[PDB]
């Protein structure tokens, strides 16, 4: 093709959007932005498919153009704006705050947070570099650049950003024994304590993680997002606490819940 593509076929859309197949030919192509195309949830999918606040894309536009939707503390009127991991969505008209947080199935849950929690977000620092006559700079997964970070902050650490001012207020190092979520791969959405990091120079480091129920998995280092110091998260977690039940336990839990009614 010549130049960039502007459309997204509904069936080539990320499967975690949980789009059906008969609504249309196209899926809302996420706009360029802080998060990657396949690692984001567009505002239209959140406000229409997840929250059911709108029935069509026209109503999503009508909501967004009234400036009711804030993403990370800023009003966004782009209905395909890419909202991704850790992003805080505030709807002040209805007085509700959400944080885009993965499910254990790898999907962005509708996770409501308190207005006090909506003041900050965790960000995994993607790189640290010196520029502009010795000024240290830090780049996060959110793609926000921060000048003058703490000298102890390194790549793969997690910082806490106050959304009102956008400066670092705390940080967790990437250490063994720290709680972390998985943001990609087969184990996407799982939460556990980092056990050990096997280093492969010139290749991908593998991080082993142990669930709160004792289940051990492993991912690439690029898929690890440190959540809290020790085993205590710095953010609220969804109803499932990052523990991925097998299909047998899911079936048993569903049957127990169904048999408890009636």
């Amino acid at each position: 093709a010549r130049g960039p593509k502007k459309h997204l076929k509904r069936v080539a859309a990320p499967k975690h959007w949980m789009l059906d197949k008969l609504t249309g030919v196209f899926a809302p192509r996420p706009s360029t932005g802080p998060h990657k195309l396949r690692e984001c949830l567009p505002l239209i999918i959140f406000l229409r498919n997840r929250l059911k606040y709108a029935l069509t894309g026209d109503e999503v536009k009508k909501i967004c153009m009234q400036r009711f939707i804030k993403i990370d503390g800023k009003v966004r009127t782009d209905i395909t704006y890419p909202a991704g991991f850790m992003d805080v969505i505030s709807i002040d008209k209805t007085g509700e705050n959400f944080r885009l947080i993965y499910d254990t199935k790898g999907r962005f849950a509708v996770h409501r947070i308190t207005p006090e929690e909506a003041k900050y977000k965790l960000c995994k620092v993607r790189k640290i570099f010196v520029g502009t006559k010795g000024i240290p700079h830090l780049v996060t997964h959110d793609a926000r650049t921060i000048r003058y970070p703490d000298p102890l902050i390194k790549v793969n650490d997690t910082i806490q950003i106050d959304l009102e001012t956008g400066k670092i207020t705390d940080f967790i190092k990437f250490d063994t024994g720290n709680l972390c979520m998985v943001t990609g791969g087969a184990n996407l959405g799982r939460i556990g304590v980092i056990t050990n990091r096997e280093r492969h120079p010139g290749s991908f480091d593998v991080v082993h993680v142990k669930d709160a129920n004792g289940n051990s998995f492993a991912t690439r280092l690029s898929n690890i997002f440190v959540i809290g110091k020790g085993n205590k998260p710095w953010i609220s977690l969804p109803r499932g606490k990052g523990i991925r039940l097998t299909i047998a336990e899911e079936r048993d839990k569903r049957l127990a819940a169904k048999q408890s009614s009636g």
């Binding site: 240290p136 000048r147 003058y148 703490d150 000298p151 102890l152």
Partner: peptide, 30 residues
Amino acid sequence: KNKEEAAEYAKLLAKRMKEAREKRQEQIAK
């Protein structure tokens, strides 16, 4: 903003090198 950020990072950086120097002095001394 530039001046305030530079001053704050100067103080924090000085404290960080103080911590690193103290830790390394303790390490070498023992």
